[PDB]
Amino acid sequence: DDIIIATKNGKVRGMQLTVFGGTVTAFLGIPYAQPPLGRLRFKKPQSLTKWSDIWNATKYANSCCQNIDQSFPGFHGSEMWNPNTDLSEDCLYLNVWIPAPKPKNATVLIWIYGGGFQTGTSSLHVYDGKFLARVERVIVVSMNYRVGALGFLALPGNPEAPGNMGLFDQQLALQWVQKNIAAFGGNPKSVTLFGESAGAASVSLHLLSPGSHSLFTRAILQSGSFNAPWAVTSLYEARNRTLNLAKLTGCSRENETEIIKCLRNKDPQEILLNEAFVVPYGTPLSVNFGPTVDGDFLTDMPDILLELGQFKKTQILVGVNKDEGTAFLVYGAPGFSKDNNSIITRKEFQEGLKIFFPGVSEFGKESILFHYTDWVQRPENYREALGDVVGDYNFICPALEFTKKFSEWGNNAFFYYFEHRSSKLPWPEWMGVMHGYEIEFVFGLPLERRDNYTKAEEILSRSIVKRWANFAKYGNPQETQNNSTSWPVFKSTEQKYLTLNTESTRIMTKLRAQQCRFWTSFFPKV
Amino acid sequence: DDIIIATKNGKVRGMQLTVFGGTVTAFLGIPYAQPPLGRLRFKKPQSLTKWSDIWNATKYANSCCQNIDQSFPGFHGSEMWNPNTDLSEDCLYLNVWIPAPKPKNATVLIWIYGGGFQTGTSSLHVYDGKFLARVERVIVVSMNYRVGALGFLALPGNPEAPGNMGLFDQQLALQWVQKNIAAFGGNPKSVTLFGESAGAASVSLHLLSPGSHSLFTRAILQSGSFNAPWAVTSLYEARNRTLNLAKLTGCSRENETEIIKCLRNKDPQEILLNEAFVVPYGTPLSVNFGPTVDGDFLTDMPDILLELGQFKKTQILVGVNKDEGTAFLVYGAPGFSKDNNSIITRKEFQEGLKIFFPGVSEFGKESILFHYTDWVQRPENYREALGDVVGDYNFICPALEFTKKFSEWGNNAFFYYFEHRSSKLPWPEWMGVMHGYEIEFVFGLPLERRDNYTKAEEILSRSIVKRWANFAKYGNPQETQNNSTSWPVFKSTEQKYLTLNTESTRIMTKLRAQQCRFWTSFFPKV
Amino acid sequence: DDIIIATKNGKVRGMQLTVFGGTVTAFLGIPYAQPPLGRLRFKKPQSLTKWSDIWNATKYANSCCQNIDQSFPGFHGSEMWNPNTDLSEDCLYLNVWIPAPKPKNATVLIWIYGGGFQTGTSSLHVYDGKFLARVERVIVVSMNYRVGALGFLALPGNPEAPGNMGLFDQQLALQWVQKNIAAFGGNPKSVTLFGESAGAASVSLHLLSPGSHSLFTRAILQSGSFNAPWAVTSLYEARNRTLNLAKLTGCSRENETEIIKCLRNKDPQEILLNEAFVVPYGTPLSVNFGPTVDGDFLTDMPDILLELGQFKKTQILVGVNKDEGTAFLVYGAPGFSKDNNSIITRKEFQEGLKIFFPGVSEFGKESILFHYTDWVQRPENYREALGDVVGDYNFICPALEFTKKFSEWGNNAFFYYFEHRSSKLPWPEWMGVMHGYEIEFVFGLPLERRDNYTKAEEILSRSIVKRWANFAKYGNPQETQNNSTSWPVFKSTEQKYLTLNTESTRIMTKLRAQQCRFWTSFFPKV
Numbered sequence A, B, C: 001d002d003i004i005i006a007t008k009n010g011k012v013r014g015m016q017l018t019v020f021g022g023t024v025t026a027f028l029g030i031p032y033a034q035p036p037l038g039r040l041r042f043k044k045p046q047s048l049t050k051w052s053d054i055w056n057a058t059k060y061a062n063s064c065c066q067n068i069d070q071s072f073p074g075f076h077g078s079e080m081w082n083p084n085t086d087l088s089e090d091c092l093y094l095n096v097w098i099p100a101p102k103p104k105n106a107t108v109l110i111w112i113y114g115g116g117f118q119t120g121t122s123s124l125h126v127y128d129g130k131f132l133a134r135v136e137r138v139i140v141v142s143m144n145y146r147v148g149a150l151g152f153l154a155l156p157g158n159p160e161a162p163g164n165m166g167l168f169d170q171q172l173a174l175q176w177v178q179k180n181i182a183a184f185g186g187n188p189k190s191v192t193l194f195g196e197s198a199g200a201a202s203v204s205l206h207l208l209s210p211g212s213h214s215l216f217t218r219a220i221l222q223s224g225s226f227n228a229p230w231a232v233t234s235l236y237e238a239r240n241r242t243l244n245l246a247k248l249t250g251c252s253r254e255n256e257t258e259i260i261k262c263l264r265n266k267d268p269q270e271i272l273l274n275e276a277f278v279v280p281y282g283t284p285l286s287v288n289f290g291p292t293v294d295g296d297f298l299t300d301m302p303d304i305l306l307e308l309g310q311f312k313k314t315q316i317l318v319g320v321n322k323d324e325g326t327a328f329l330v331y332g333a334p335g336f337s338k339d340n341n342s343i344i345t346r347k348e349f350q351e352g353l354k355i356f357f358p359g360v361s362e363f364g365k366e367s368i369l370f371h372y373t374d375w376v377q378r379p380e381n382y383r384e385a386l387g388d389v390v391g392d393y394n395f396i397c398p399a400l401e402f403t404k405k406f407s408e409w410g411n412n413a414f415f416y417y418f419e420h421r422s423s424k425l426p427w428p429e430w431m432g433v434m435h436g437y438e439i440e441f442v443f444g445l446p447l448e449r450r451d452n453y454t455k456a457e458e459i460l461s462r463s464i465v466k467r468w469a470n471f472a473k474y475g476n477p478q479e480t481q482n483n484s485t486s487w488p489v490f491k492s493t494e495q496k497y498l499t500l501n502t503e504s505t506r507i508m509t510k511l512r513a514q515q516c517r518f519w520t521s522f523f524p525k526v
C-alpha cells in the first residue's frame, strides 16, 4: 500500500496521508479529459482515450491559465487565492480524497472553485478535501475547469467557440465521478455539488442544465447564484467581447471560424493580457468571459427557467457572509486601503458608486445613494454603506431571491447567514466577515489543532462540517447530537435562515428585506 | 449548405431563408404519406415506402381539393384564406422550420389549419413558421390534411369510407414528427399542437383520441373546440349525407361498398360541386363533411368523454376573439355588406336568425331574439346583437365550456380573450376583432419591420409569441421579463382569463357568463 | 411423507408433528452458512457451497458459544433461558415451521432471540414456531446468530474482526429465507421480522441497515430498540474492549491483524471466560460485546439515521411489559432476592443505583434518586422505585422514543403495554409482569390445553397471536371478529397505546410521560 484503483480509464496510484491520527488516501491530479490544446482550444472537453499502465496521482496538477492578483505582493490575504501550481493550457485534472479504510458506499462531495470564472484552482490549501474525508467519512472530489476567455469565449452556436467550455469541463468531471467513483467506494447515487462565488453560480447552473440533471443528487451554494448580476452574459456582449478580443490581437476577420483559427494560434499570455480590455469600462467585479445562453448547456435564459420551475427538483443549502462587499472595495474604491481604516466622504461614496456601477444612469446611482445613505453623525457611515451596496447587490440579494423562487416549486431549501470573522484573518477589522472567508470553516481547517484558530472556532467548524456532511448524506443540515439549534426549512412565506457564529446560532426571518426589495423590485428597472 | 437531413424515409434538402438578420432552415413540402389516389381515395392515410435518393423540399406542396370562397374576388380580406398552391388529390405533405444553427433539443410546435374541415392549407402566408423558429428558437411543423367529403366522407364502420380520414392524416403527421423530428434536432418529447377554428377543434379531438395520446405533449386551442355546434356530425347525418352525395352524382346502390366504388371514380370537381348540396338547408357555417364518431379515432361521443374525464391529461391554452361572429354575417345575413356599415332592422334580425338556425323551432328562435335583444334607441343594436349571437353560440361558449370541463379533471388551463383589431385589417370597422384575425399575431407577422403594423402591434405580437412559446416549452404562458401581467390558471370556480390587447392586458372573470348560460343550459333543449 | 423440500442448496427432510389435532411440518437445524471455524472465526458469515444429497433436518442444531446463567441452579425461572443444545462454534443453522398441508403463499415470520447479544438460542421451548404455524397458518423461521465476542468482536474497519458479525448472520438468514422460502410455500414478499430484547434491538437495526431493506416487509419490536442504552457500543469502547480482551489472553500485539491471529487460536472457553472482564465495572445489564458503527451494516451512528428519517419505511408494532426492570434487580441489587419479598432501604436504593449506573456522576445519580423517590409511609416504595428506574431507563423509554421518532416520518406504528403476569411464573409476585415474559403468550404457548395456563390466559394468547398474525399479514394488528378493542395508530402527537391483559384491553395515552421526559430530555446530559 502502495494503493491502486482500477478506473474505467486505467490505474491510478494514490498516497496515504496522516490526518488527526488517521489515514486518508489522496488521488491528486487525475486527468478527466484530453488536454484541450491547439486544435482543441476553445472546444468542449474531449473524451479520455484509455491510458495503458499506472498513473501516479500524487501531486496536484497544473492550474489553468489565468491572470494573477498582484495588488498586494507578499500579502497572504490576497495571495492565498492565487494559483499554487504551474499555469498551463493543460489542466483538466481532478482530485479525490477517500477516507481510509476504503469505505463501502460513501456519499461524495464535489467542490467547484470560485473566482469570477476568471481565476481559481482546486489545489488551494483552503480546498483541501483531506479533512472532510477523515472526519465525516465522505469522498471529496474537486476538479479544475477552464476560466476566462479560454473557458468561456463565446461565439454563439459556432462549434469552434460555442461558449461555456469551462462549464462543460465541470460537467465532464461529474460524468467522471459518475462512471468511476464506485471503484473508490463512492456512491454515484448520493452526490452533492458544492461551490462558492462563481463556484456556487456554477452549481446553480447545473441545477438548470439538463445535461447535469442526473450527474448529482443535491446542491450547496455559498455566496453565489446564477441570477447574480455578474454571473451570466448576454449573447450580445458575449459577441462584442469575442470580437473586441479579436481586434485587440489583430484577429478580426470575415469567416468567423477564421477568427477562432487566428486566436487558436496566439500565445495564452497574449490572450490573458487583453481579456482585461474587452469591455468599455470595468469593475473590481467584472466577469469579462463567463457563462452564456449557449442553447446547449443553458437552453434558454436561466431567469426564465428559474421563474417557471425548469430545474432539477431536490434540496438545496444556500447562504452568504455578513460582509460580502468589503473585499472588493480595496481594488478601486477611492479612499479604501487595506491599511488605513478607510473612512470615506459622501463625495467619495458617490465616487465609489461610479466605480461599481459604470453604465448605470445618473438617476440609478442616485437611488442607490438615496436608499443606502439614510443614516440612523457616525464617521464610518459611508464606508459601511458602500460595502453593503456591493454586498447586497452582487451576492446577498440574488442569493436570497434564488432560494426564494427555488423553494416555490416545492423543494426543501435551507439558508445560512455566516457571520464569523476568522481570528487569523489577514485583512483589517473593518472588512469584517469577508467574501470567501467561510470556505476554510467548511473544509474544516480549524479542526487542525496546531493551527491557532480558537476553541470557539474549532467547535464552529466541527458543527458546520457536520451540518454540511449531513445535508450531503440525508438532505438535512441538522446537527442532531450536541443539543443544537434546529435548522428550519426556508419557506417563501416566512423566509427563515440560521445564523452561523461562535456564540449562539439563531433562527431569524427575512434577511435584508428592506434592501433586497430595492435590488430586486426597483433597480432592474433603472 | 446545401443542407440535407436523413429522415427514416430518405434524405431531404432544405433551404436557408433570411429572417431578421438570421438564418432559418425551411423544409417545405415533405411527403408524410402515400398519395391517396383512385383506389386509396376515402381511405386512411397509407404508410410511406422509403424513397431512394434526395427529396428537394423547397417549395410548398399541393393544397388539397376544396372549393374556393369567391364572394369577393380581388378582396384580400376574403382571398388571403384561399389556397395558394395547386389543388390536388395528391396533397399529404408537411413543412418544418428549424432555426439555424440546427438546435439541440428544440420544443416543436405543430400547426393545424382551420376552415370548417372544408377548406384550408398549410402554405398560407399567415401560417409561416419561419418567424417562430427565428425568434423563439423552436421547430414549427405544419401539415395538410384532406378536407370536405374527400377527408370526412363517412360510411360508419365501412373501411372503404370509414370517416375522419383527414383527422387520421393529421395523426399520421404527428407520428411522422414522432419518428423524425429528432433528426432536425426536435425533441419528440416536448410537442405542442396548436390550431384555429376547425384546427382548434382538431387539436381538441386529439386530446380525446387514444391514438394520439402519445404523439404530443400540450395543446393550444384558438377559437374552436369539438363541442362547438359545427364540429362533429351525428352518425345519422353522416350517412344521410353520404347517400345524398351518392344520389347527387348518380351513385346510389345496393352493395354499400359499391357506392364507394362508384364515387371513387368521379372527378374531384364533380364531388366538390355537390358537397354544398347534401343538406336540406345550410348556413354560412355549414360544415357538411366533418369528424364523426367512427369508433376508431373517436371511440364514443366526445361530449361524454369530455364529461367523464376521458382524455389526455395535460395543460391547455384556450381563447377566442372579441367578435368571432361578424365574419360570417356577410355571407348571407340580409342587410350585411362588407361595404355599408350594415345597420339592420328588427325585421332583418329575425331574418338573420333564420339563416343561422335553419332547423330550429320557432320558439327556439324566439328565445334567442328575446335573450339578445333586451336593449340597454341605438341604431347598431340589432347589427351587433346578431354578431354576438353567432359569436357566442358557435365559438365563445363552446370554447369556454370546454375549458371549464377540462380543468375540472385537475389540469392547468389558461384562457385568453383576444381583443385587438389589426390596423391593416381589410374588412370594415364594424366587423371588429374578427374570427381568425389573431393568427397573424401568433405567428409573429407584426415582427417584420417593413410591414406597417404599428409599434403597439409589434410589441403585442412579441408578447404573445413569447407566451405561446413559453407555454409550449414549459406549460406556462407567462411573459416573465418585461414586468408583464401574470396569466392566472383558469379554475372552474372563479374562471379567470387574460385579455390580450395593445394597451393594458387585464385579468377578468366569467367571460360572457350571462349569454353562455343561455347557450349552455337552455338552448340545447329547444 | 417422508417429506422433502428442494432448497437452492440441496434437499432437506422435515418431520411431521401433531398440533391441536393437526399436522405441522418442522424443518429443524438447516445450515444457512458455512461454519465459521478457525480461519473464519470473527468474520462475516460465508456462503453455503451447495451440499449433495439429503439433509435430515429433524433436531434443533447446536446453540452458539456463550456463558450460562448460574445464579439459580435448578430454578426454572432462570434456567428456561439457558441454551438447550450443545454450545459450539458451529452453530449457523435455522428452523422453519410450515403448516400442513403445505400452504400456497404464506406470510413468513422470522424470530430473532434476545439475550444482550451475549446469550440465547432459537431452540428454546418458548420460541416454538409449531403453534403459530398451526393456528394462523404462517411460516415461522428462526435462526441462531453468533453472540458475545465471537459475534461482535470489533476491530473497526479491520476485515478480520469487522464487528457486527452476529448481525450479518441474521442478515444472511434473511437472504436465505429470501431465496428459499418459496419452496416451502412461503411468500418472500410478505416477511415480518420480530424479536425481543436484543432481538428487538436487532430488528430495529435491520430497519436501518440498507443491506436488509429488501429482505423483509414489516417489523415487530418487543421490549427493545437500538436506541436503548445497552444496545450499541461506541467505536471507542469497541476497541478498548477488543484490546482488553487481547491483554487478558496474552494476545497484545503490534500488527493488529496479528491480535486476531492470536485470538483466532485460543479456546472458545478461554475467550468466553474473559468476556466478563473487558470493562472496568459492569452491570447486570452489561452488553460487553455488541453492535457497533461498522460503516458496513451500520453506516453512521443510528440515532442520527433515526433522527433524520434514514430507514426502511413500513409499519411497525412496538411494546413493552409493565415491569421490565425487576428481572435484573436480583443479579446484584443489595437487598433483592428472588426468595424474600425484597423490601429495601433508602440507603440500599442509593446502593442499587451505584450498581446500575457505575460511571454516572454523583449528581447524575442524585437526579435519578430525586425524580423517582418523590413518594405518594409505604414499605415497598424504594423496592418498586428501583425497578422502574431500570425498567424505564433501559426499555420503556428508549422503546417509546423510537416509536415516536419513527412514526414522525409518516409510517403507521402501533404500541402495546403488556401487563399480564403468567400464573405459571416461577419468580415471586413482586417482580410482576417481567422482562421477557410475554414471549410465551406471543408464540401461543397458553393455547396448549394440557398446560395449565388459565382460560383467561388462553383467550389472551389467542388474541395476541391473531393481532400479531394480522399485523404480519396486513400491517394492522386488529382482532376483527370477537368484538375487540380497535388498536389505534400511534401518532407522535397523542401517543396512544393499547394495554394487553386478561380483563379489558384499554386505549391510553402518553405512556410514562413524566418519567421518560427525564430519561429522554434531561439524563443524556449528566
Ligand SMILES: *[C@@H]1O[C@H](CO[C@@H]2O[C@@H](C)[C@@H](O)[C@@H](O)[C@@H]2O)[C@@H](O[C@@H]2O[C@H](CO)[C@@H](O)[C@H](O)[C@H]2NC(C)=O)[C@H](O)[C@H]1NC(C)=O
Binding pocket: A237, A240, A241, A244, A245, A247, A248, A277, A278, A279, A280
Ligand atoms: C463593444 O465594443 C465597442 C468597441 O470597444 C473598443 O474597442 C475594443 C477593441 C477595446 O479596446 C475597448 O477598450 C474599446 O472601448 C465599444 O465601443 C466603445 O465604447 C464606448 C461606446 O459606448 C465609447 O466611449 C468608445 O469610444 C468606443 N470605442 C471606440 C473607440 O469605438 C462598445 O462599448 C461595445 N458595444 C456595446 C454597446 O456593448
Ligand SMILES: *[C@@H]1O[C@H](CO[C@@H]2O[C@@H](C)[C@@H](O)[C@@H](O)[C@@H]2O)[C@@H](O[C@@H]2O[C@H](CO)[C@@H](O)[C@H](O)[C@H]2NC(C)=O)[C@H](O)[C@H]1NC(C)=O
Binding pocket: A333, A334, A335, A336, A337, A339, A340, A341, A342, A343
Ligand atoms: C487611506 O489610504 C488611501 C490609500 O493610499 C495608500 O495607502 C495609505 C496607507 C497611504 O500610505 C497612502 O499614501 C497610500 O497611497 C488614501 O488614498 C490616497 O489619497 C490621496 C488623496 O486624498 C491620493 O493622493 C492618493 O492617490 C490616494 N490613493 C488612492 C488610489 O486612492 C486615502 O487618502 C487614505 N485616507 C485616509 C484619510 O485615511
Ligand SMILES: *[C@@H]1O[C@H](CO[C@@H]2O[C@@H](C)[C@@H](O)[C@@H](O)[C@@H]2O)[C@@H](O[C@@H]2O[C@H](CO)[C@@H](O)[C@H](O)[C@H]2NC(C)=O)[C@H](O)[C@H]1NC(C)=O
Binding pocket: B237, B240, B241, B244, B245, B247, B248, B277, B278, B279, B280
Ligand atoms: C336527408 O336527405 C333527404 C333528401 O335530401 C334531398 O335530396 C338530396 C339528394 C339533396 O339534393 C337535398 O338538397 C334534398 O333536400 C332530406 O329530405 C328533404 O328535405 C326536407 C325533409 O325534411 C324536404 O323539404 C325535402 O323536400 C326533402 N327532399 C326530397 C325531395 O325528398 C332530409 O332532409 C334528410 N333527412 C334527415 C331527416 O336528415
Ligand SMILES: *[C@@H]1O[C@H](CO[C@@H]2O[C@@H](C)[C@@H](O)[C@@H](O)[C@@H]2O)[C@@H](O[C@@H]2O[C@H](CO)[C@@H](O)[C@H](O)[C@H]2NC(C)=O)[C@H](O)[C@H]1NC(C)=O
Binding pocket: B333, B334, B335, B336, B337, B339, B340, B341, B342, B343
Ligand atoms: C347595405 O348593403 C346591402 C348589400 O347590397 C350591396 O352592397 C351595397 C353597397 C349596395 O351597393 C347594394 O346595391 C349592393 O347590392 C344592401 O342589401 C340589399 O338591399 C336591397 C333591399 O333593401 C335588395 O334589393 C338587395 O338585393 C339587398 N342585397 C342583399 C342580398 O342583401 C342593403 O340594403 C344596404 N343597407 C343599407 C340601408 O345600408
Ligand SMILES: *[C@@H]1O[C@H](CO[C@@H]2O[C@@H](C)[C@@H](O)[C@@H](O)[C@@H]2O)[C@@H](O[C@@H]2O[C@H](CO)[C@@H](O)[C@H](O)[C@H]2NC(C)=O)[C@H](O)[C@H]1NC(C)=O
Binding pocket: C237, C240, C241, C244, C245, C247, C248, C277, C278, C279, C280
Ligand atoms: C479501557 O481499559 C482500561 C484497562 O482496563 C483494565 O485492564 C483490562 C485488561 C481489564 O483487566 C480491566 O478489568 C481493567 O480495568 C481501563 O483502565 C482501568 O480502569 C480504570 C480507569 O478509569 C482504573 O480504575 C483501572 O485501574 C484501570 N486499570 C488499569 C490497572 O490500568 C479503562 O477503564 C478503559 N478506558 C476507557 C476510558 O474506557
Ligand SMILES: *[C@@H]1O[C@H](CO[C@@H]2O[C@@H](C)[C@@H](O)[C@@H](O)[C@@H]2O)[C@@H](O[C@@H]2O[C@H](CO)[C@@H](O)[C@H](O)[C@H]2NC(C)=O)[C@H](O)[C@H]1NC(C)=O
Binding pocket: C333, C334, C335, C336, C337, C339, C340, C341, C342, C343
Ligand atoms: C433478603 O434476602 C437477601 C438475600 O440473602 C439470601 O437470601 C435470603 C432468603 C437469606 O436466606 C439470606 O441469608 C441469603 O443470603 C438478604 O441479603 C443479605 O443481607 C445481609 C445483610 O443484611 C448480608 O449479610 C448478605 O450478604 C446479603 N446478601 C446479599 C448479597 O445481598 C437480605 O438481607 C434480605 N432482606 C430482608 C430484610 O428480607
Ligand SMILES: *[C@@H]1O[C@H](CO)[C@@H](O)[C@H](O)[C@H]1NC(C)=O
Binding pocket: A013, A056
Ligand atoms: C510512481 O511513483 C511511486 C513513488 O513511490 C513509485 O513507487 C513508482 O516507481 C512510480 N512509477 C513510475 C516511475 O512512474
Ligand SMILES: *[C@@H]1O[C@H](CO)[C@@H](O)[C@H](O)[C@H]1NC(C)=O
Binding pocket: A104, A105, A187, A189, A190, C210
Ligand atoms: C450503494 O448504495 C445505494 C443506495 O443509495 C445502492 O442502491 C447501491 O447498490 C449500493 N452499492 C453498494 C452495495 O455498495
Ligand SMILES: *[C@@H]1O[C@H](CO)[C@@H](O)[C@H](O)[C@H]1NC(C)=O
Binding pocket: A462, A463, A466, A479, A481, A482
Ligand atoms: C459534540 O461535542 C463533542 C464534545 O462534547 C464532540 O466529541 C463531538 O465531535 C461533537 N459533535 C459534533 C457534530 O460537533
Ligand SMILES: *[C@@H]1O[C@H](CO)[C@@H](O)[C@H](O)[C@H]1NC(C)=O
Binding pocket: B013, B056
Ligand atoms: C434539387 O434542387 C437544388 C437547387 O439548388 C439542386 O442543387 C439540385 O441539383 C436539385 N436536384 C435535383 C435536380 O433533383
Ligand SMILES: *[C@@H]1O[C@H](CO)[C@@H](O)[C@H](O)[C@H]1NC(C)=O
Binding pocket: A210, B104, B105, B187, B189, B190
Ligand atoms: C432531449 O430532451 C429530453 C428531455 O425532455 C431528453 O430525455 C432527451 O434524451 C434529449 N435528447 C437529447 C440529448 O438531445
Ligand SMILES: *[C@@H]1O[C@H](CO)[C@@H](O)[C@H](O)[C@H]1NC(C)=O
Binding pocket: B462, B463, B466, B479, B481, B482
Ligand atoms: C422586452 O422588451 C425589450 C425592449 O425593452 C425587448 O428587447 C424584448 O424582446 C422584450 N421581451 C419580450 C418577451 O417581449
Ligand SMILES: *[C@@H]1O[C@H](CO)[C@@H](O)[C@H](O)[C@H]1NC(C)=O
Binding pocket: C013, C056
Ligand atoms: C434420515 O433420517 C430418517 C429418519 O426416519 C431416515 O428415514 C433416513 O434413513 C435418514 N438418512 C440418513 C441415514 O441420513
Ligand SMILES: *[C@@H]1O[C@H](CO)[C@@H](O)[C@H](O)[C@H]1NC(C)=O
Binding pocket: C104, C105, C187, C189, C190
Ligand atoms: C404470492 O403472492 C405475491 C403477492 O404478494 C405474488 O406476487 C406472488 O407471485 C405469489 N406467488 C404465488 C403465485 O404463489
Ligand SMILES: *[C@@H]1O[C@H](CO)[C@@H](O)[C@H](O)[C@H]1NC(C)=O
Binding pocket: C462, C463, C466, C479, C481, C482
Ligand atoms: C373468537 O372467539 C371464539 C370463541 O367464541 C373462538 O372460536 C375464536 O378462535 C376467537 N377468535 C380469536 C381471533 O380470538
Ligand SMILES: [Cl-]
Binding pocket: A322
Ligand atoms: Cl447585519
